[PDB]
Design an enzyme around this catalytic site. Structure first.
Site, PDB file in Angstrom:
ATOM      1  N   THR A 189      12.365 -19.734  28.027  1.00 27.14           N
ATOM      2  CA  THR A 189      13.933 -19.921  27.559  1.00 27.14           C
ATOM      3  C   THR A 189      14.566 -20.892  28.514  1.00 27.14           C
ATOM      4  OG1 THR A 189      14.309 -17.542  27.192  1.00 27.14           O
ATOM      5  CG2 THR A 189      16.172 -18.966  27.956  1.00 27.14           C
ATOM      6  N   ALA A 214      16.214  -9.925  26.941  1.00 23.41           N
ATOM      7  CA  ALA A 214      16.942 -10.056  25.712  1.00 23.41           C
ATOM      8  C   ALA A 214      18.141  -8.958  25.718  1.00 23.41           C
ATOM      9  CB  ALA A 214      15.902 -10.131  24.671  1.00 23.41           C
TER      10      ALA A 214
END
EC number: 3.4.25.1
Lengths: 204, 250, 242, 198, 222, 212, 244, 233, 241
Positions: F1, F49
């Site tokens: 990410t 997440a």
């Protein structure tokens, strides 16, 4: 790791002829780093003296706790707490934290204001009382103190002589311990007066 | 179930009186007389064993009780209330003092604890005040001998000598005449027996009278030898025989 | 004395009935539902000329699609509004959608009977019934524009038009004759203004009365004083026209 | 760790605190002020565990500001330091301890003397002429032991700190991105905006 | 020491069409190297035109599906029989999973149906509630074998227009229910060939505006 | 990410990648890492997440409640602190999140707050968070000016995420851009790295090391 | 149920008064009088012992003057036992403060705390209030010598001179008559004894019926000293001031 | 008399009566009328919905508890919501834990016991609502009558609410007939609507005024309102 | 454990404990507040049932909740302490979580909420107190003045008074306060405040305290003289006619 070896420090008490002595070093460190050379480890409530070695934060918390309890005691009893009584109060206060103990080595010194009898006592971190008549030792240099005291000590010493004895015991023990030293104070106690002296010692 | 009486049962009336405490005091007034006299070397507390039937064994009912080895108590009013107060007093002497200082509490402090227990039954929710007045006698190293009275309100006061219950007014007057600050324990015992005689109707002897003293230490009542500093209890209950011997010199 | 959850010989809960009596002494509130939205209007009723009227909040937003007006002990309505706002916001967090107006009302009404000193059914800790009534107005895709009347009894009714407060009996009679399935939002506004004017002790103006509406397009909005002042003027004109 | 230094001169206490905030491999910020004003004459600097640091500081600030309003008075530095010590001492024996070390610099308006308190996360308190937390002390205490004097002026104190910072920028492994310096005296708390090259 | 989790194998597949959606799953249930059952349904019709499958540790998968079906039931009770939209079911499921953030339902869950515009919809979840709406998604034991295939045959990844020098990507024409069923069956015959936990049977649930339909196909039993 | 946000003349740029993984397995290339807290607030996600999604969605509900209660838009400072204090309550339990709260209020102007699961809350002009943060910092730090055109800023942000998507194995998919102004945020599209890379290579002449 | 026997100790009367508080105050008005007078160099506390006998041990007795701190003391008017309950919690609050800040507690803070405890029994809990009124005499380095008073309602106020218990009306009038801002402790001692002497419901004012205490900053030292007079000391000061 | 013994539910009157319970029972009689009747294949609930103004809706009187069970109310609506909710959970528990549909007889026992607790303890109050429970379980069609006193009875048919006595007599007369209306829902309903109209007086059952519910052999509990009840008016 | 319902409805729809709480307020010393164009002033009267008090230490009638907000009241003094403490705590909590001091309306709404809760919670009686809360919202210069009562109802006022004879002083204010032209000066505002109080205090230089609150935490209380001077100049306005 060992809460009792983080800050360093020592305390010793001796009885003499109608008198008692309690002494301590002034060091306060953090492992190898010396932080303060003015950390006294002896306190008094009325005419009763208490010395405490071990973790500094607990040394401070315990002093505040006993000031708190002896103050209430005086207000209710209308008299100052005695050495023998205070020793029991320390013991019960420490055992109360049996499974989450204060990491300290308390030492009591004083003279019963009614019988004139000199008194001293020691404790382990959970309250067990050690009531020797000669001397009590505590701290990171306790082995050394036991050595000095057993050798130098003798019964019924006069205040002026006891002072030389307690001092030499403290000083030479401190000098063989890396976590002890950096200054020292000695208290000579008599029924009527108490003298406090700061000793000159190695600063390393 | 569940105690839902969480409000006070003793409240202030328009005149400022606390009814339940006044009424408890009235119950104390109907009670058998009990008294206490302080001497220079001891204290005596006494009362009458008003047996509720000749078939009853008056010895199995103690109106005079030991609280600590140097403190005793006696009362006037409701016997059952007294009994539980003694249980609580004996226990608090340990939990609030002996288990902390390793020694029994001085008389005034234990009296203070009892008084607190009684005051609470005056304000706590769902209860009535204790219907008794106590006379507590004792000794401790720094205060010497002392005698106290504790009333239903929780109030307590020290006395040289006093009486409570039925004929307390007459007995207090008789004590004011005979009391002086030079009395020896035996003298106080004698005065106690004389005062009690005016309050008793029927038989007056060592089996109808209950009397105890707080005097010297009794090494023979300790139970062991070998420790010099432990000399024994100062509290001692006189025997029926000891009481009679003194009644002949009445 | 007598329990707070006691029944009268007629089968009514004393405290709830006495609660309704307090609501009758409150300021008037009126609501009118049309196929173009729902209008909510209230009587400010300040108690002194020194009281800054705009600080009087008797019409509040519950969510964008739900608003409500109160009448009676208005302070009692805060925890109800707080509960309603939380219920609406929470529903959206749990389901990614708007809560239905009826559901929101049922939730507010669940609080109503939760009072007593130890009623065996759960833990109703609240010493007395709420002393205020509410008009909940809003819109949802399934049932469109709606108006509900929530009382301290826990029961709620859906109305085409409803009035609560001191002038309710009179105002309700008026609503009975004026309402019809084809009123427009504009007609409704004037109609609320008119009925409020009839029942209010004071002469109705943009400072002692307040309007609001909720439409599918813009949600719940409280009309500012200038906008209502014009509606007042427009009303006077149509009335004086016959 | 972060750099936290303090020094008490004649009429003031100077606090110096590093400006870097490093998380793992990146220096996220280089202008971080690791301090909170507890009262007009009391300042507290702090270093330690990531989140606990600010949470503790702000919590203490709130409590002191509350005391100030309730009493319309300002607690003495010694009083504040004792309050802070008790809080840390309670924390060390709780479920999850605040791992925060602090320096408290204050000017006691009643005694008219500056005061410096060093307290670690265990509740260990000591009053000193100069102090530091973490690795900083290992290089600065010997410097100050050598160059410190009780009668120094606020200006001599600042030159002493500059000396300390230079030693830290020479021997310490980490780039702490300089320090923010604040002075506490009879007139309050002010920040020396010009230390990036004094 | 006691391990609260287990692995029952299985693989599931969800594909969204323009006006339909499918959720398939093999019917084999296993433990280590043994077969517990050759026919143990893993995909369920939960009402309101929603199909769901929580694959991984079967006990956890059953508890979740059971709890969601009950959620649907209460949704009707508390909101005047309103139909639970697919997007709303997804959010609800996130809270169900996150409720056990510190003792997770060890499952990879997929739901399918139609959104409020009548379009095919598929949602896939993390064991703790992370979710996203997608075109297709394989889950379970053979997910790593199937997903690459689906990226290529359903979304035409890495496929270009012949002769355009890889300058023009193959257009995203959408699949019919017949074309999707073909991909599903092939995905599973391939998965059965290469993964020892996949086989025995394939059960597909199809969702259209007319409801839920089911188709069954045998798979190799070795 | 890889996520980033920076302040400049035209306001705030917010850019994130869209890859989700589970070990070396690429779970998704189409994940939303920016949640529109509300018409004026943006939240970025890195780390767990579920943790980010659940709590940032929860943050929006708490922000909405504030506006209903106070009849005023919540400040970026108060919003970021709600998440920060919540996360601090759970310290030690294992939450995992690296986040940026970005907004624009009349009272504060363009504002960015970094908030993570350790409980750290920092206000600042530039932040890159995620496994690819260093790569974005590299490109972003060497081309930043407070005086960039909304157009040039949007590109720098997009270019920075691209740099990270190329070098970080755990970053990629596509770039999602946002511009923040007082009247709210403006979405600036989804840019697949698949096509974005080649386009940028040719038009810019960079990534000279790859053969194309 | 129980509701039948609940007196409801914490409700308002139609006039907005608290029944139980008003009745507790009525109770206080029958207790021995207590007087407090603040001077420039100290404070004086004097109280009349209600009810006495020849046999009452006055040396070991204390029913009106209590030490709370080394710097703070109180004079009591009302139910002694209720007072001991409050005195003990006040002694605790003072020690807690000293433990927290390493400074003796400011007089007002301790007074406010005790007053708040009293106020509580006035608004919740359904228990009777404490039938007590206190006169606090203390010293701190912020306001110096201070004198406060608190009653069953939880309200407290500061004074230069004040009285509580029986005949406060007559006593307050006398104090307001001879009090002077520049007074000195010895003047105060005399004013206190004279006032009690004129308001006593008893025959004469003898030492066995009094309790006396002063808080002075004995010049030859620099610290504050609390002196709770002994029987003999009261007997003396009684003769000197001309009451014999 | 009465006045001294009707203060709470925990007090018996000198004749052994519990007035608070009797007063709760009175709230039922003030409630709108509702009827219930069953054959061997279906069970039916018919209720007259009451409105406040002509501008208000008619408050619902029938609540679904599960696919095979439901009830109608008369009295305090909120209490009906509490009780029906408890029943929804009990039906739920039975399905989730034993995969079993809750027997109507068992549901009645659970309702009785829940109501009883509120008639023997201090602080609480009896429920002020009556309930008619219908359902189809493993032993056929069922109809139960619930009273706030805790008394639950199984009947072929019955009615509660104001003027409920009319319908009750009609049903006690029609017994032999409707009890045999098997395999024909529309007939059982008409039989119920005829029973309820025997308690009318004020008006006549309209479309937004009537409410019907049915459950049976191959019929999940379903509620019919408005247009859906037109063919029965 | 004590949870008896003390505040309940009576047959006519009233809650007597709340109503009687107001009676306790009517019995309290008078308090007034008037807002100027750039300030707000709070005045209170001092009883005289007993005089020989030590003004230095006796708790004052106006309390600071935070550096920019103050609160005065009428009613039971002991009860007011509870509300003041809670308000002070809430003010610090708000700065801690929102990083901004409370607005005057927020603080008022909080105090009022506490009062309302004590009217429908078991085992407690309502506060016999009504308050006046004034100050300036952070970074704002528009004056604020609100009032709360036992029921929990609150609202803002141009000027308002509560306590004994508040009926009288309110009349004075209703026909002496023009919303068109509020006291454009700290001085003429303090003057209107003193005037309104004299209508009921009946000559009391030492029976009238005043506190002036200006923007940005500028709060200060006047001394006897400063006030005594206002009284003097006002008794002349009368005699000069």
């Amino acid at each position: 790791s060992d809460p009792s070896s983080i800050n360093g420090g020592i305390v010793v008490a001796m009885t003499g002829k109608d008198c008692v002595a309690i002494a301590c070093d002034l060091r306060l460190g953090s492992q190898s780093l010396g932080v303060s050379n003015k950390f006294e480890k002896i306190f008094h409530y009325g005419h009763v003296f208490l010395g405490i070695t071990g973790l500094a934060t607990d040394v401070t918390t315990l002093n505040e706790m006993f000031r708190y309890k002896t103050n209430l005691y005086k207000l209710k009893e209308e008299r100052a707490i005695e050495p023998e009584t205070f020793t029991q109060l320390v013991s019960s206060s420490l055992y109360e934290r049996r499974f989450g103990p204060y990491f300290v080595g308390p030492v009591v010194a004083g003279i019963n204001s009614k019988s004139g009898k000199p008194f001293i006592a020691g404790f382990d971190l959970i309250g067990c009382i050690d009531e020797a008549k000669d001397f009590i030792v505590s701290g990171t240099a306790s082995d050394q103190l036991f050595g000095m005291c057993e050798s130098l000590y003798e019964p019924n010493l006069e205040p002026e002589d006891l002072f030389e004895t307690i001092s030499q015991a403290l000083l030479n023990a401190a000098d063989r311990d890396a976590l002890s030293g950096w200054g020292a104070v000695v208290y000579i106690i008599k029924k009527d007066e108490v003298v406090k002296r700061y000793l000159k010692m190695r600063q390393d | 179930m569940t105690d839902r009486y969480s409000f006070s049962l003793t409240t202030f009336s328009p005149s400022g009186k606390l009814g339940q405490i006044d009424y408890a005091l009235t119950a104390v007034k109907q009670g058998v007389t009990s008294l206490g006299i302080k001497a220079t070397n001891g204290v005596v507390i006494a009362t009458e064993k008003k047996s509720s039937s000749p078939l009853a064994m008056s010895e199995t009912l103690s109106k005079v009780s030991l609280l600590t080895p140097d403190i005793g108590a006696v009362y006037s009013g409701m016997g059952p209330d007294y009994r539980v107060l003694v249980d609580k007093s004996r226990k608090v002497a340990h939990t609030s003092y002996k288990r902390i200082y390793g020694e029994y509490p001085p008389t005034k402090l234990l009296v203070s604890e009892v008084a607190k227990i009684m005051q609470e039954a005056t304000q706590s929710g769902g209860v009535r005040p204790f219907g008794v007045s106590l006379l507590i006698a004792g000794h401790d190293e720094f205060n010497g001998f002392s005698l106290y009275q504790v009333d239903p309100s929780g109030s307590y006061f020290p006395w040289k000598a006093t009486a409570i219950g039925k004929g307390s007014v007459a007995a207090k007057t008789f004590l004011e005449k005979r009391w002086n600050d030079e009395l020896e324990l035996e003298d106080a015992i004698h005065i106690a027996l004389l005062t009690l005689k005016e309050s008793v109707e029927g038989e007056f002897n060592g089996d109808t009278i209950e009397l105890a003293i707080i005097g010297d230490e009794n090494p023979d009542l300790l139970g062991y030898t070998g420790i010099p500093t432990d000399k024994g209890p100062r509290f001692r209950k006189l025997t029926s025989q000891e009481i009679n011997d003194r009644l002949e010199a009445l | 004395d007598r329990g707070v959850s006691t029944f009268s010989p007629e089968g009514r809960l004393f405290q709830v009935e006495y609660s309704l009596e307090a609501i009758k002494l409150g300021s008037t509130a009126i609501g009118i539902a049309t196929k173009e939205g729902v209008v909510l209007g209230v009587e400010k009723r300040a108690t002194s000329p020194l009281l800054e009227s705009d600080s009087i909040e008797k019409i509040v937003e519950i969510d964008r699609h739900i608003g409500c007006a109160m009448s009676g002990l208005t302070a009692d309505a805060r925890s109800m509004i707080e509960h309603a706002r939380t219920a609406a916001v929470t529903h959206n967090l749990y389901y990614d959608e708007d809560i239905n107006v009826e559901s929101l009302t049922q939730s507010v009404c669940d609080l109503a009977l939760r009072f007593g000193e130890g009623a065996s059914g759960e833990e109703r800790l609240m010493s007395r019934p709420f002393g205020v009534a509410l008009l909940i107005a809003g819109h949802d895709a399934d049932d469109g524009y709606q108006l509900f009347h929530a009382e301290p009894s826990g029961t709620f009714y859906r109305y085409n038009a409803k009035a609560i407060g001191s002038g309710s009996e009179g105002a309700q009679a008026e609503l009975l004759n004026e309402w019809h399935s084809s009123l427009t939002l504009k007609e409704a506004e004037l109609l609320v203004l008119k009925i409020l004017k009839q029942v209010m002790e004071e002469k109705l103006d943009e400072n002692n009365a307040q309007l609001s509406c909720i439409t599918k397009q813009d949600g719940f909005k409280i009309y500012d004083n200038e906008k209502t002042a014009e509606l007042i003027k427009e009303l006077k004109e149509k009335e004086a026209a016959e | 760790m972060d750099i936290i230094l303090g020094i008490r001169v004649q009429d003031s206490v100077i606090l110096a605190s590093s400006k870097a905030v490093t998380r793992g491999i990146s220096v996220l910020k280089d202008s971080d002020d690791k301090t909170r004003q507890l009262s007009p004459h009391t300042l507290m600097s702090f270093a330690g565990e990531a989140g606990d640091t600010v949470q503790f500081a702000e919590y203490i600030q709130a409590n002191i500001q509350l005391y100030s309003i309730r009493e319309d008075y300002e607690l003495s530095p010694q009083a504040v330091s004792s309050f802070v010590r008790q809080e840390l001492a309670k924390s060390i024996r709780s479920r999850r301890p605040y791992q925060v070390n602090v320096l408290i610099g204050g000017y006691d308006k009643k005694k008219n003397k500056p005061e410096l308190y060093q307290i670690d996360y265990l509740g260990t308190k000591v009053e000193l002429p100069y102090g530091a937390h973490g690795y900083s002390g290992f290089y600065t205490f010997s410097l100050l032991d050598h160059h410190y004097r009780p009668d120094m002026t606020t200006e001599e104190g600042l030159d002493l700190l500059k000396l300390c910072v230079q030693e830290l920028e020479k021997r310490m492994p980490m780039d702490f991105k300089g320090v923010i310096v604040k002075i506490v005296d009879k007139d309050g708390i002010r920040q020396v905006d010009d230390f990036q090259a004094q | 020491q006691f391990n609260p989790y287990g692995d029952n194998g299985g693989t599931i597949l969800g594909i969204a069409g323009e006006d339909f959606a499918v959720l398939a799953g093999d019917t084999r249930n296993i433990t280590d190297y043994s077969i517990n059952s050759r026919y143990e349904p893993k995909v369920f019709d939960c009402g309101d035109n929603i199909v769901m499958s929580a694959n991984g540790f079967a006990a956890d998968g059953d508890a979740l599906v059971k709890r969601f079906k009950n959620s649907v039931k209460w949704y009707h009770f508390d909101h005047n029989d309103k139909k639970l939209s697919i997007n709303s079911a997804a959010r609800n499921i996130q809270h169900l999973l996150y409720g056990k953030r510190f003792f997770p339902y060890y499952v990879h869950t997929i739901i399918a149906g139609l959104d409020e515009d009548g379009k095919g919809a598929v949602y896939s979840f993390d064991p703790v509630g992370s979710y996203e709406r997608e075109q297709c998604r394989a889950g379970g034991a053979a997910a790593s074998l199937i997903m690459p295939f689906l990226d290529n045959q359903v979304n035409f990844k890495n496929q270009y227009e012949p002769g355009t020098n890889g300058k023009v990507k193959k257009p995203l024409k959408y699949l019919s229910v017949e074309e999707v069923i073909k991909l599903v069956r092939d995905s599973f015959t391939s998965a059965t060939e290469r993964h020892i936990q996949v086989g025995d049977g394939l059960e597909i649930l199809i969702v259209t505006k007319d409801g839920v339909r089911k188709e069954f196909y045998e798979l190799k039993r070795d | 990410t890889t996520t980033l946000a920076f302040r400049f003349q035209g306001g705030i740029i917010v850019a994130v990648d869209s890859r989700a993984t589970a070990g070396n397995w690429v779970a998704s290339q189409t994940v939303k890492k920016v949640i529109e807290i509300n018409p004026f607030l943006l939240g970025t996600m890195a780390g767990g997440a579920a943790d980010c999604q659940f709590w940032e969605t929860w943050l929006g509900s708490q922000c909405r409640l504030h506006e209903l209660r106070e009849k005023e838009r919540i400040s970026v400072a108060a919003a970021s602190k709600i998440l920060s204090n919540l996360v601090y309550q759970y310290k030690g339990a294992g939450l995992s999140m690296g986040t940026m709260i970005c907004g624009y209020t009349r009272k504060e102007g363009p504002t960015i707050y970094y908030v993570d699961s350790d409980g750290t809350r920092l206000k600042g002009d530039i932040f890159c968070v995620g496994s690819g943060q260093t790569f974005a910092y590299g490109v972003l730090d060497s081309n930043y000016k407070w005086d960039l055109s909304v157009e040039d800023a949007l590109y720098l942000g997009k270019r920075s995420i691209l740099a990270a998507a190329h070098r970080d194995a755990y970053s990629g998919g596509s770039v999602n851009l946002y511009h923040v102004t007082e009247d709210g945020w403006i979405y600036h599209g989804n840019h697949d790295v698949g096509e974005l890379f080649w386009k940028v290579k040719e038009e810019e002449g960079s990534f000279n090391n790859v053969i194309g | 149920g129980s509701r039948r026997y609940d007196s409801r100790t914490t409700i308002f009367s139609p006039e907005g008064r608290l029944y139980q508080v008003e009745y507790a105050l009525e109770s206080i008005s029958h207790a021995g009088t207590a007087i407090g007078i603040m001077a420039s160099d100290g404070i004086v506390l004097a109280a009349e012992r209600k009810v006495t006998s020849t046999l009452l041990e006055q040396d070991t007795s204390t029913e009106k003057l209590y030490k709370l701190n080394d710097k703070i003391a109180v004079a009591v008017a009302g139910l002694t036992a209720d007072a001991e309950i409050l005195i003990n919690t006040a002694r605790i609050h003072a020690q807690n403060y000293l433990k927290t800040y390493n400074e003796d507690i400011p007089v007002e803070i301790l007074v406010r705390r005790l007053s708040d405890i009293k106020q509580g029994y006035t608004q919740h809990g359904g228990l009777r209030p404490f039938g007590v009124s206190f006169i606090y005499a203390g010293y701190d380095d912020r306001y110096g010598y201070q004198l406060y008073t608190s009653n069953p309602s939880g309200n407290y106020t500061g004074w230069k001179a004040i009285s509580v218990g029986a005949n406060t009306s007559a006593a307050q009038t006398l104090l307001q008559m001879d009090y002077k801002d520049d007074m000195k402790v010895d003047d105060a001692i005399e004013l206190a004894l004279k006032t009690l002497s004129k308001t006593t419901d008893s025959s004469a004012l003898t030492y066995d019926r009094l309790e006396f205490a002063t808080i002075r900053k004995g010049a030859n030292d620099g610290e504050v000293y609390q002196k709770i007079f002994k029987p003999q000391e009261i007997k003396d000061i009684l003769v000197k001031t001309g009451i014999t | 008399f009465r006045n001294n013994y009707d203060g709470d539910t925990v007090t018996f009157s000198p004749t052994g009566r519990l007035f608070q319970v009797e007063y709760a029972l009175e709230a039922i009689k003030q409630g709108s009328v509702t009827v219930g009747l069953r054959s061997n294949t279906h069970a039916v609930l018919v209720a007259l919905k009451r409105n406040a103004d002509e501008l208000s809706s008619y408050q619902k009187k029938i609540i679904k508890c599960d696919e095979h069970m439901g009830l109608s109310l008369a009295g305090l609506a909120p209490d009906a919501r509490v009780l029906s909710n408890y029943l929804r959970q009990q039906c739920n528990y039975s399905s989730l834990v034993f995969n079993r549909k809750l027997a109507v007889e068992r549901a009645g026992h659970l309702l009785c016991d829940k109501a009883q607790k509120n008639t023997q303890s201090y602080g609480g109050r009896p429920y002020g609502v009556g309930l008619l429970i219908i359902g189809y379980d493993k032993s056929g069609a069922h109809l139960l009558e619930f009273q706030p006193s805790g008394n639950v009875t199984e009947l072929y048919g019955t009615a509660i609410g104001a003027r409920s006595q009319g319908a009750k007599t009609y049903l006690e007369r029609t017994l032999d007939t409707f009890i045999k209306i098997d395999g024909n829902p529309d007939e059982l309903i008409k039989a119920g609507v005829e029973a309820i109209s025997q308690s009318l007086r004020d008006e006549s059952l309209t479309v937004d005024n009537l409410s019907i519910a049915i459950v049976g052999k191959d019929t999940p509990f379903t509620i019919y309102d408005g247009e859906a009840v037109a063919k029965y008016i | 454990g004590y949870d008896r319902a003390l505040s309940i409805f009576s047959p006519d729809g009233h809650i007597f404990q709340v109503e009687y709480a107001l009676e306790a307020v009517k019995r309290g010393t008078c308090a007034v507040g008037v807002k100027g164009k750039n300030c707000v002033v709070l005045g209170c009267e001092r009883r005289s049932t007993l005089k020989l008090q030590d003004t230095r230490i006796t708790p004052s009638k106006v309390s600071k909740i935070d550096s920019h907000v103050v609160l005065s009241f009428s009613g039971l003094n002991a009860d007011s302490r509870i509300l003041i403490e809670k308000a002070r705590v809430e003010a610090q909590s708000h700065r801690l979580t929102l990083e901004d001091p409370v607005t005057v309306e927020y603080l008022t709404r909080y105090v009022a909420g506490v009062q309302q809760r004590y009217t429908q919670s078991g085992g407690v009686r309502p506060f016999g107190v009504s308050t006046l809360i004034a100050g300036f919202d952070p970074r704002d210069d528009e004056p604020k003045l609100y009032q709360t009562e036992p029921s929990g109802i609150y609202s803002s006022w141009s000027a308002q008074t509560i306590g004994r004879n508040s009926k009288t002083v309110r009349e004075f204010l209703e026909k002496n306060y023009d919303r068109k032209e509020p006291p454009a000066t700290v001085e003429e505002c303090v003057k209107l405040t003193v005037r309104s109080l004299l209508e009921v205090v009946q000559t009391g230089a030492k029976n009238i305290e005043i506190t002036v609150v200006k923007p940005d935490s500028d709060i200060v209380a006047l001394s006897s003289e400063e006030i005594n001077q206002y009284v003097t100049q006002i008794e002349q306005e009368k005699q000069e006619q």
